[PDB]
Design a protein around this ligand. Structure first.
Ligand SMILES: Cc1cc2nc3c(=O)[nH]c(=O)nc-3n(C[C@H](O)[C@H](O)[C@H](O)COP(=O)(O)O)c2cc1C
Ligand SMILES: Cc1cc2nc3c(=O)[nH]c(=O)nc-3n(C[C@H](O)[C@H](O)[C@H](O)CO)c2cc1C
Ligand code: SF4
Ligand code: SF4
Ligand code: SF4
Ligand code: SF4
Ligand code: SF4
Ligand code: SF4
Ligand code: SF4
Ligand code: SF4
Ligand code: SF4
Ligand code: SF4
Ligand code: FES
Ligand code: NA
Ligand code: NA
Ligand code: NA
Lengths: 191, 318, 207, 443, 333, 196
């Protein structure tokens, strides 16, 4: 019952993109189509699902019983970097090469602010193995849902008369603000 | 040496009779009896606020349509509808500038920044109401709805229902007619007038029965499955107005028939989830606003079948 | 058989890639540990000083303070029927020329809007409230961060004999009544619960 | 008789102003004094003139020779003298090579015309030869050659012939008069077509507002058990060769595959009457029916008029203009073509002349889309016209093609029901033309 | 002090070494993509996604090389020098090209070619072509709704107050986006050095064209006799000029009775403007080149020649062994 | 000649906030006042200068396959040193920006400029580029923070303007109140870019 509540809070009540201001740059970058959004979502889900357990083991097996808690951040980012490299090492080989249209947002997966953010959040909340895994999966699913909804709204807006001066980024920011209001309605629930 | 000077164009050469202005005027005619009941119950200040909102809306639109070098299409009676529906969402103890700010936000940002009429994807009036509630919670929460002459009530029916004190709530007939001690928003206290207005619009052909029927059916089923009263949960709060006039917006609803059923079911589920376990006494506005975001996703999976197409089993995209 | 017998030097270029990284990592550590040392000491000192400042304002007097060995704190928490433990952090005793002046108690109540608030309360000998303060909060800067302002100053003068309740109205009625901030209610209730548990601890101890 | 019923999904309900000319008797035009006959009265390859200036021609003499296989000859309507073999204005807006013949007053029949035979000995090959020699094209509006339609390729199988009697456009009443007056000729033409194709099944589809025509056809059929009559609900796109197939047989024509792949052969009642008349008498196609009506016509009526008579003579024979017209249309109000002048001659596919006044020809300027969704509900092909129009208006042909814009039948109604008074069908036509053009310059 | 420095150094070094070795091993496996000759042509391209292409972008052109699936000179917008720089990475090429600009062959402006009727609908050329081809008196003229302006990506076309477009030669870059977008097939490409253009597209006979427009072509054929280099031909009842054989003699301009040929009477008149430095008293140009224009006696330098006639073709500028004659345009205005 | 152009690319021509849209999380998260934006901009400028100089000093031995680990190691070392100093000496700014001070290592601008300009240039161009980017980031953050604070609190730099009876717009200091504001600003700039 605790795992379900943790997942629900991570997905709906405390969405990482629309509430906590973490995954914003790829949110505005690769949300022009539905397929690219789905691919980015599944890649990011794999990255956090692999990273959470490794960060938990590294923090609780080495850093804590050594009085070396000031290296945490740099150690953490090192691991994430290697993982992202391996992801960038696979997508060009086996995954379709036409998906290399992200345009600098592929090496910025380390910079996505949601992997390291969820790692620090899991460390600060004193969770366990299963709780950390569920929190990471819930955060990834929330990111995927938000980016898919944004891509659908943009595809709908493709046939609207945005006059001449707003066009891409201003109307993307206004749409994100309206979605943020709608999710501000989804708050105050105690779980 | 007489010429003819005829006209050349493309087919067809005949059209129907209905237009946009007729539709909006019919909507206003449907909304009139609720305004009459509000003026009877809350007094002369309940009408003036409405006027203020309407004026502001029209003025804003004209100014924008003058500054962007566009034809002034203010005679389609759309800003009047937006202003009236926004004014129906206000308490009786609100200052004069709240309506002006809400109308400016509803017209300038939500509507005219996306192209104009029919080019937006979200409800203007509900978004302006949500912005006003978040910005100024003191003027819109639980005390502004009670008139200053009454000093015995001190609570609206939904707040008493959430608190568990179902011994002092008004009777079901009083909640259905809105005539004995029922307080709230000025255009939501009576369910008979809104039902008559919705039936008139169904008869004319502007709206359909699907969303209004399925919204209320889902609410009743949810209320019956948890051990509550289905009739009370349907005649209190802003549910009839939302079901008949605000969830049937043209620019925010799906165009098919199955998408409308899914949209209504989702709205009815989220409304009761926020009502029963949320941090608000009512969740109609956010349930409708959350289904304006998922609408483009429903519309890509509920398309009909073309004539003469027997479909290929997912082999064209391979 | 390692993908068709890679030709010898394919291993040698491995030794080039790791070593440099190793060196870089060492250099990073060779900085950070030194930057760890002196700052840490200063940080600790500053924190301690700040903490004692937070005490010296809560009980305006010229006296000394003594701290319990924290086993009595756990004994007090175990008794009286405290539902949620570990919510009492520090209890201090004031001493001025031997006579007991009062107590200073720090507690973190749960059930806030955004987590845990830290509330410090001081009390004189006879049951009164000489003032409260907020040490740590994570609330909204424009909505829940107003507790550390003029709202605190109204807490003084209340007797430490009965409980305190919150009323959602401008009228303050009479005794043991707290008027909440408009648009911010859960934060007021958390501080009220913390003050109530402090009063219960004082009533148990001073008898 | 066993009369069945049929209907389809979608459509509109126009005012159906046919009551004006329905009760008026049938009129006959006077003898013309000058005829202009174009060289392209069909689709395919235009003919070549075989007459010179100053020549003398007979009634029914050929004045044009077909070029290829998809082509029909062109004959003369009156007997007189040829005065010009130049090019003259056409109904398409541009000048077309024609032959001008001045009448003499006497109708001298060419001394080479004799009846072809009877139904019991003609057989299929001679029936097809007679159809080709008489220059019969489709009178339903498309003017497709009939001898090409009756030549079924060996890789296709058909088993039924359907006659189209569901006249659906407003103001038009010629088919009602033809069915009520010449039902026996319609039945004979249906039997001839059935023998030519080689099937044993035949259906006739008539709408339910022509019950007298249904009774006349039932009486004319007699005791034949291979012929049936259907009643269809009165709707506008009912008679468009596809909804007729869906209503009568229940089958669906595939995506871009012609009705011949559904096993049916669709033909008009006027074509059947012309086939029967040409078999009985031996004369070619030189005369048809018309409906002169509108808002600026003094005395609207249905009149039989030869081929080559200008529009102005027809207008003058029906009273004239009560007021200044604002629009002259060749055909119906939902699929007609607006004209520039009144020197246009009538053709084999002309079914009516509609003149509108200045007040009835005014349509408001288009406005913004309000997302009402009625155009989705009225489409018989189950498309979404708003998306295709919005994609076509900003030059996105790939999105138009991916949204199935190539199977629209250009039927009107989607543009008829719009509250914002837009031009959806024109945008769909532009998209279709661009998609068709891009397949030739890139392949 | 020793351990506090020793432990983190060892831990971080071990982590870095293990991660580096693993990353090298993974790179030796998954990087078998084996695409050689890194693009190196995108820098020599300058591309702006104009439209004289159809490979999915200039980066797609950079990726498409080393496979031999694309032409060397597939990009005409950049020019021959741009293609030379693009495929100069491997080299073995050299070339040059000629610059061109878009032009409109029509001069009927809303008063010489009026309208037959009134048109209702959208203001676009193709939409007007749906409504029976338009409402203009001339069936081959300009509609005037500016589709070509709408499809131009570089902003070079402006619709004038007379109804005909105007093209800025400084902003037009030799593409054809406005050429296939015109429903009337009116927009064409002409070299920037050409000033003699027949501006009409009427395919009718004499009387009908004369009634249709003020400056129509009636196919009289008087412009063919004036030309002697066989550069202008009349077919399909319309005249056209071949730009590869036109010497710009300005003889057909003044012979047209309906004023369909562009250009002004300011040309030539420089018969034997011979530099005295590099002719040897040649005596060869005096005899004949179709006009007399030279006649004299020996003509020792400086030359004494009166200039009052001849057409100024330009043949006497390159046929000389030393090219002592200089061509200079000097006339009234 | 080649230094002033790199220094002055910076704020106007290639502004990271208005023209590139990078580093959006601290832009939309901490800009509820005119003081947080300035401190965040100064800290990011110091980290950017140090990281750019360090990376450009070593563009001769780093291979292509392990560039990201070395880059993040250097950036994280500089971030840790700066954060330790700020914790020691400026505790109020640390408490105001607690979560985003460890997150300067991943800021979408430092890594982007490291792999695009610092890797293939000298020690003098990278320094000027870092200074220009830091100045542009600081100016944009200060402008956005002042605009948000004036509307949502009724005071600029802590000095009240409208009196003590003013009722603020509390949505401007909320997460949905940033997006719209930023969008409008960008639109205005684009208009003045395109109509001039
Ligand atoms: C919208 C639409 C309506 C039509 N209505 C009729 C009609 O009422 N009567 C008719 O005979 N053909 C009508 N047609 C033409 C038929 O589709 C078909 O071409 C015709 O039956 C062929 O007749 P034919 O074999 O004599 O050429 C219509 C076509 C369209 C697209
Ligand atoms: C049936 C119907 C319902 C409408 N509902 C709303 C509504 O809930 N809120 C609003 O602001 N405007 C409403 N409008 C009017 C409004 O101008 C329009 O529908 C678009 O939402 C404007 O983009 C409604 C109009 C119609 C015809
Ligand atoms: S889209 Fe085509 S088939 Fe559908 S209603 Fe319009 S014209 Fe008819
Ligand atoms: S009928 Fe007209 S206004 Fe309604 S959805 Fe279709 S195109 Fe839009
Ligand atoms: S025409 Fe040449 S430069 Fe332009 S987009 Fe195509 S390939 Fe690139
Ligand atoms: S040149 Fe062609 S495309 Fe341009 S306005 Fe004239 S007709 Fe239209
Ligand atoms: S005017 Fe025509 S050729 Fe010139 S740039 Fe524009 S589209 Fe290209
Ligand atoms: S006649 Fe020639 S110049 Fe005159 S409008 Fe027609 S094409 Fe243009
Ligand atoms: S300018 Fe001279 S060369 Fe050119 S077409 Fe005219 S006469 Fe011939
Ligand atoms: S002289 Fe002029 S009018 Fe005559 S053919 Fe030549 S261009 Fe045409
Ligand atoms: S043509 Fe040349 S070589 Fe001959 S006389 Fe003239 S300048 Fe001399
Ligand atoms: S311009 Fe021609 S004709 Fe005149 S002198 Fe030179 S070569 Fe002879
Ligand atoms: S995702 Fe760009 S800085 Fe956080
Ligand atoms: Na947010
Ligand atoms: Na939110
Ligand atoms: Na840090």
């Amino acid at each position: 019952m605790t795992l379900i509540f943790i997942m629900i809070s991570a997905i709906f009540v405390n969405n990482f993109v629309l509430s906590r201001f973490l995954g914003i740059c790829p949110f505005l970058g690769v949300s022009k189509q539905v397929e690219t959004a789905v691919g980015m979502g599944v890649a990011v889900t794999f990255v956090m699902a692999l990273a959470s357990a490794i960060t938990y083991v590294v923090q609780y097996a080495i850093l804590d019983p050594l009085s070396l808690g000031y290296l945490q951040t740099i150690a953490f980012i090192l691991i994430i970097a290697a993982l992202v490299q391996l992801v960038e090492m696979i997508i060009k080989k086996s995954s379709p090469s036409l998906y290399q249209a992200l345009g600098v947002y592929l090496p910025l997966i380390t910079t996505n602010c949601a992997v390291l953010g969820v790692a620090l959040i899991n460390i600060q909340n004193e969770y366990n193995f299963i709780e950390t895994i569920f929190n990471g999966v819930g955060a990834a699913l929330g990111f995927t849902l938000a980016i898919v909804l944004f891509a659908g709204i943009r595809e709908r807006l493709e046939t609207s008369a945005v006059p001449k001066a707003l066009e891409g980024f201003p109307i993307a920011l206004l749409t994100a603000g309206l979605m943020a209001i709608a999710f501000l309605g989804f708050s105050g629930m105690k779980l | 040496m007489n010429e003819l000077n005829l006209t050349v164009s493309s087919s067809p050469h005949i059209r129907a009779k209905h237009s946009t202005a007729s539709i909006m005027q019919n909507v206003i005619i449907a909304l009139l009896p609720a305004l009459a009941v509000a003026g009877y119950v809350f007094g002369l200040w309940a009408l003036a606020l409405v006027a203020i909102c309407v004026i502001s809306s029209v003025a804003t639109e004209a100014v924008i349509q003058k500054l962007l070098k566009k034809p002034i299409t203010v005679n389609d009676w759309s800003a009047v509808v937006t202003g009236v529906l926004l004014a129906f969402n206000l308490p009786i103890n609100a200052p004069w500038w709240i309506g002006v700010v809400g109308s400016v936000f509803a017209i300038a940002i939500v509507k005219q920044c996306f192209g104009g009429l029919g080019q937006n994807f979200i409800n203007p009036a509900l978004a302006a109401r949500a912005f006003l509630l978040a910005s100024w919670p003191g003027h819109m929460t639980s005390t502004a709805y009670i008139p200053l002459t009454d000093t015995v009530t001190t609570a609206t029916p939904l707040a008493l229902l959430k608190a568990g004190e179902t011994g002092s709530m008004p009777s079901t007939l009083d909640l259905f007619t809105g005539l004995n001690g029922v307080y709230g928003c000025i255009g939501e206290i009576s369910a008979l007038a809104l039902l008559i207005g919705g039936l008139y619009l169904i008869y004319k052909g502007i709206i359909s029965w699907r969303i209004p029927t399925i919204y209320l059916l889902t609410i009743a089923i949810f209320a019956l499955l948890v051990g509550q009263d289905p009739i009370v949960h349907m005649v209190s709060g802003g549910v009839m107005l939302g079901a008949f006039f605000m969830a049937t917006d043209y620019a925010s609803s799906p165009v098919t028939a199955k998408g409308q059923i899914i949209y209504a079911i989702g709205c009815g589920l989220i409304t009761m989830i926020i009502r029963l376990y949320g941090g608000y006494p009512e969740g109609c506005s956010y349930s409708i606003l959350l289904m304006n975001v998922a609408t483009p996703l429903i519309e890509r999976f509920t398309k009909e079948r073309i004539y003469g197409v027997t479909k290929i089993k997912k082999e064209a995209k391979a | 058989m390692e993908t068709k017998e890679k030709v010898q030097i394919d291993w040698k270029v491995v030794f080039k890639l790791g070593l440099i990284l190793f060196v870089i990592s060492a250099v990073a550590a060779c900085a950070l540990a030194l930057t760890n040392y002196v700052t840490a000491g200063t940080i600790e000192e500053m924190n301690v000083q700040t903490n004692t400042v937070a005490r010296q304002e809560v009980l305006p007097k010229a006296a000394d303070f003594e701290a319990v060995p924290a086993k009595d704190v756990e004994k007090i928490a175990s008794e009286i029927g405290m539902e949620k433990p570990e919510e009492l952090l520090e209890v201090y005793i004031g001493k001025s020329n031997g006579e007991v002046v009062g107590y200073t108690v720090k507690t973190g109540p749960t059930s806030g809007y955004a987590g845990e608030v830290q509330v410090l309360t001081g009390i004189s000998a006879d049951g009164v409230i000489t003032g409260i303060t907020i040490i740590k909060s994570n609330e909204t800067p424009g909505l829940g961060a107003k507790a550390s302002g003029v709202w605190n100053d109204q807490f003084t003068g209340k007797s430490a004999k009965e409980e305190l309740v919150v009323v959602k109205g401008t009228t303050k009625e009479g005794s043991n009544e707290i008027q909440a901030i408009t648009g911010s209610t859960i934060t007021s209730k958390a501080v009220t619960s913390g003050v109530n548990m402090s009063i219960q601890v004082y009533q148990n101890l001073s008898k | 008789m066993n009369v069945k019923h049929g209907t389809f999904k979608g459509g509109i309900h126009p005012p159906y102003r046919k009551e004006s000319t329905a009760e008026v008797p049938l009129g006959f035009g006077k003898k013309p004094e000058m005829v202009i006959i174009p060289m392209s009265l069909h689709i395919g390859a235009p003919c070549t003139p075989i007459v010179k200036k100053g020549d003398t021609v007979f009634l029914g003499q050929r004045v044009g020779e077909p070029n290829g296989f998809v082509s029909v000859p062109v004959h003369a309507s009156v007997s007189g003298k040829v005065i010009a073999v130049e090019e003259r204005p056409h109904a398409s807006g541009d000048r077309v090579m024609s032959v001008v013949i001045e009448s003499d007053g006497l109708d001298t029949i060419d001394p080479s015309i004799k009846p072809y035979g009877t139904l019991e000995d003609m057989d299929a090959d001679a029936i097809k030869k007679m159809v080709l020699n008489a220059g019969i094209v489709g009178l339903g509006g498309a003017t497709f050659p009939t001898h090409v339609k009756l030549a079924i390729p060996p890789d296709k199988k058909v088993d039924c012939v359907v006659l189209n009697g569901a006249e659906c456009e407003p103001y038009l009443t010629a088919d009602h008069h033809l069915m009520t007056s010449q039902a026996e000729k319609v039945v004979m033409g249906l039997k001839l077509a059935m023998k030519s194709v080689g099937v044993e099944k035949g259906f006739i589809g008539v709408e339910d507002n022509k019950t007298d025509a249904i009774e006349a056809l039932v009486k004319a059929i007699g005791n034949d058990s291979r012929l049936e009559v259907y009643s269809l609900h009165t709707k506008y796109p009912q008679g468009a060769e596809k909804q007729l197939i869906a209503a009568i047989t229940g089958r669906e024509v595939p995506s871009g595959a012609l009705p011949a792949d559904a096993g049916v052969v669709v033909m008009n009642v006027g074509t059947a009457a012309q086939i029967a008349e040409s078999m009985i008498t031996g004369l070619p196609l030189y005369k048809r029916y018309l409906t002169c009506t509108g808002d600026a016509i003094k005395n609207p009526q249905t009149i039989e008029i030869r081929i080559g008579v200008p529009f102005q003579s027809v207008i003058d024979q029906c009273g004239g203009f009560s007021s200044e017209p604002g629009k002259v249309i060749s055909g119906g109000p939902m699929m007609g073509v607006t004209q520039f002048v009144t020197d246009i001659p009538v053709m084999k596919g002309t079914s009516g002349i509609l003149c509108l006044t200045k007040e009835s020809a005014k349509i408001a300027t288009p406005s913004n889309c309000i997302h009402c969704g009625k155009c989705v509900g009225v489409c018989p092909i189950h498309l979404q016209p708003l998306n295709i129009a919005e994609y076509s208006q900003r030059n996105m042909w790939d999105k138009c093609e991916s949204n199935n814009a190539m199977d629209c039948i250009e039927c009107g109604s989607c543009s008829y029901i719009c509250p914002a008074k837009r031009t959806l069908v024109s945008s769909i036509r532009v998209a279709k033309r661009e998609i068709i053009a891009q397949r030739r310059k890139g392949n | 002090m020793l351990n506090a420095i020793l432990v983190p150094v060892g831990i971080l070094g071990v982590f870095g070494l293990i991660f580096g070795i693993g990353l090298a091993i993974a790179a030796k496996v998954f990087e078998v993509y084996e695409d050689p000759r890194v693009p190196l042509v995108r820098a020599a391209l300058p591309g702006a996604n104009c439209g004289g292409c159809g490979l999915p972008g200039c980066d797609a052109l950079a990726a498409n090389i080393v496979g031999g699936s694309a032409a060397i000179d597939a990009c005409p917008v950049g020019g021959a020098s741009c293609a030379a720089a693009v495929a100069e990475i491997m080299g073995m090429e050299a070339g040059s090209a000629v610059k061109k600009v878009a032009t409109v062959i029509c001069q009927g402006t809303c008063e010489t070619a009026p309208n037959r009727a009134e048109y209702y609908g959208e203001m676009d050329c193709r939409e007007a072509m749906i409504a029976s081809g338009g409402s203009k008196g001339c069936r081959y003229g300009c509609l005037g709704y500016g589709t070509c302006k709408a499809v131009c990506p570089f902003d070079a076309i402006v619709i004038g107050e007379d109804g005909l477009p105007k093209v800025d030669p400084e902003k037009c870059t030799s593409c054809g986006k406005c050429v296939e977008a015109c429903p009337k097939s009116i927009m064409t490409l002409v070299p920037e050095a050409q000033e003699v253009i027949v501006k009409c597209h009427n395919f009718d006979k004499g009387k009908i064209a004369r009634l249709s427009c003020t400056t129509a072509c009636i196919a009289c054929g008087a412009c063919v006799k004036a030309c002697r280099f066989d550069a202008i031909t009349v077919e399909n009842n319309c005249a056209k000029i071949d730009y590869d054989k036109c010497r710009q003699c300005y003889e057909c301009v003044d012979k047209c009775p309906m004023n369909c040929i562009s250009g002004d009477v300011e040309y030539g008149k420089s018969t034997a403007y011979i530099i005295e430095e590099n002719c040897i008293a040649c005596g060869l140009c005096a005899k004949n080149c179709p006009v007399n224009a030279i006649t004299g006696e020996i003509k020792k330098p400086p030359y004494v020649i009166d200039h009052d006639m001849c057409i100024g073709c330009g043949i006497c500028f390159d046929k000389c062994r030393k090219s002592a004659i200089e061509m200079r345009p000097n006339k009234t205005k | 000649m080649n230094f002033m152009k790199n220094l002055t690319r910076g704020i106007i021509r290639e502004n990271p906030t208005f023209v590139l849209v990078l580093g959006m999380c601290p832009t939309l998260a901490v800009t509820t006042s005119a003081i947080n934006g300035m401190g965040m901009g100064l800290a990011t400028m110091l980290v950017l200068i140090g990281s750019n100089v360090a990376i450009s000093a070593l563009r001769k031995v780093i291979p292509d396959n392990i560039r990201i680990p070395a880059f993040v190691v250097v950036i994280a070392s500089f971030v840790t040193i700066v954060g330790m100093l700020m914790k020691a000496y400026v505790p109020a700014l640390d408490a105001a920006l607690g979560i985003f001070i460890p997150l300067i290592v991943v800021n979408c601008i430092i890594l982007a400029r490291a792999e695009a300009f610092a890797f293939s240039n000298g020690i003098a161009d990278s320094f000027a580029d870092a200074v220009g980017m830091g100045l542009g980031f600081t100016l944009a953050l200060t402008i956005l923070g002042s605009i948000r604070e004036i509307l949502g609190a009724g005071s600029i730099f802590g000095f009240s303007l409208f009196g003590a009876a003013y009722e603020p717009v509390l949505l401007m200091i909320l997460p949905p109140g940033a997006f719209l504001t930023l969008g409008l600003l960008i639109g205005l700039i684009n208009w003045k870019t395109k109509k001039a």
